[PDB]
Structures are given as structure tokens and as C-alpha cells.
């Protein structure tokens, strides 16, 4: 039985993280009218089975929801409430993306005392998770430094016109794409990683991957995907189940790079 208040579903294996749903039933509805950022969309489970966390995921610079909506799907069906945002103007600098995306981390906990909202009374507005691909990367390890509240964070390809995040205290996954030349792994990714030494913190780079080797429609969808919800629930719900997919080498030829701290099973 478990002890766990926040844990969620049942006891997971690589094959049902590496699937492309988990066992919740998704459904996602369209914000109306967005507080503090563009639009967005919020994914949801409907028989999670208690509360959820919340995460919000930004896109990257000029790039919009379809560049990272297959995180809301797959984050909701394993228990999260997720919302993919389009930025006030997809040209909003990284500083900007934190405040939006906290903003939507803030409305997904009004819109949970909102009797009409389908996520009414769904989401533990206590245990908040950001996630953004490049400027949107930058923009969420931004919302960790100014808010250790916040549970959890993992970003593809981060950018951000500095790679000091030595005081982030949230633990962060990065998944770096190899060949990436945007945001280059041995610039941006990799110094970032290094940067932080008060958090359980990972990096992994993806093979061959270009700047949006991450992005909707990539082919390694079971591993980061696999690595993302591993990654969210251990942190977001103590969810030591989790541990050893979250924490330990995944061993998968997809990988060419492998580095952890601070990381407890």
C-alpha cells in the first residue's frame, strides 16, 4: 500500500514510461482569456485519482504551443496538469518567458477555484513544475531561481544570454541535443549543468540531435519522454518509485552524453 499522499498511479516500468500515453485519460480544453501571457492550452487527467501538480511549458523564441504540445499529453496521461503557452509576442526575451510562465502557473491555480473550469479541484496549486525549449529553457530555469517554491524543472536545448544558474535550488533535468547550433551543448546546456550545485540536477544529450532534437514530432519520444514524467514525478511527488528512472543512467544508445548530482533513490 502506499504511504505516499501525493503519489499517483500505479508502479511504472521503462515500457509504460516509453509508451505514448500513461494510464490517465487526457482531455484539454483552450484558455479564454490568459493573464500575463498569449494563449494557452491545459492538459489534463480526469481520474488521476487526487490532486496534481502543475506544470507550464514555454515554446522558444518565434516558435509557438505545436513546438512542445506533445509534453501535455504525455506529462497528463501519467498525472499532471500541464498548460503549453504562446508567449505575448513570440519575440519575448527569456526574462520575459519566466514571468509569463509563472503567470500561467498562477491562472491554472485560479482557474482550479473556478467551479466551470474541467480541472476544478484537480491540481495541488502547491506543487508547481516549469518546462521550456531554448529561450523558453532559459525562461524556466529563470522561474527556478526566483522561485525555489517551485518543485521541479527539465528544458530542451536551453538558451539564455548568461549560463549562471549556480543559485538554482529546484531540480533540473536538461536534455541537450548533440548537434545543436543555436544553442550549442559545450555553450549553453553544459555550462548551465555545471553551474548548479544546490540542486539534484541532470544532463543528458540526445545523439544527433539538432536545436529541436526535443520538439514535437522527434524520434526519441520514448526515452525523453520516459525521462521528463520520470523526472517530474520523482520530484514533484516524492514519488520514489520513480528513482531509479529519474536518477540512473538510462543506458540507451539514443544518449551520448550521461551526467547526474544529487540525485536520491
Known sequence: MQTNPYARG????????????????????TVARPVGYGAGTVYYPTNAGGTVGAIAIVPGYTATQSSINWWGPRLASHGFVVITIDTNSTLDKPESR??????????????????????YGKVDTARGGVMGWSMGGGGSLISAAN?????????????????????????????????????????????????????????????????????SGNSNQALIGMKGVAWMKRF?????????????NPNSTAVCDFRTANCSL
Open 10 to 29: 500505479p508502479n511504472p516500468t521503462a515500457a509504460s514510461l516509453e509508451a505514448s500515453a500513461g494510464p490517465f485519460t487526457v482531455r484539454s480544453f
Open 98 to 119: 519566466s514571468s509569463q510562465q509563472m503567470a500561467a502557473l498562477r491562472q491554472v491555480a485560479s482557474l482550479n477555484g473556478t467551479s466551470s473550469s474541467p480541472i
Open 147 to 215: 522561485n525555489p517554491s517551485l518543485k521541479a524543472a527539465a528544458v530542451m536545448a536551453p538558451w539564455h544570454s548568461s549560463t549562471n544558474f549556480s543559485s538554482v535550488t529546484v531540480p533540473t533535468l536538461i536534455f541537450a541535443c548533440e548537434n545543436d547550433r543555436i544553442a550549442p551543448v559545450k555553450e549553453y546546456a553544459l555550462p548551465i549543468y555545471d553551474s548548479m550545485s544546490l540542486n539534484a540536477k541532470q544532463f543528458l544529450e540526445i545523439c544527433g540531435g539538432s536545436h529541436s532534437c526535443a520538439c
Open 236 to 248: 514533484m511527488d516524492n514519488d520514489t518509485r520513480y528513482s531509479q528512472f529519474a536518477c540512473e
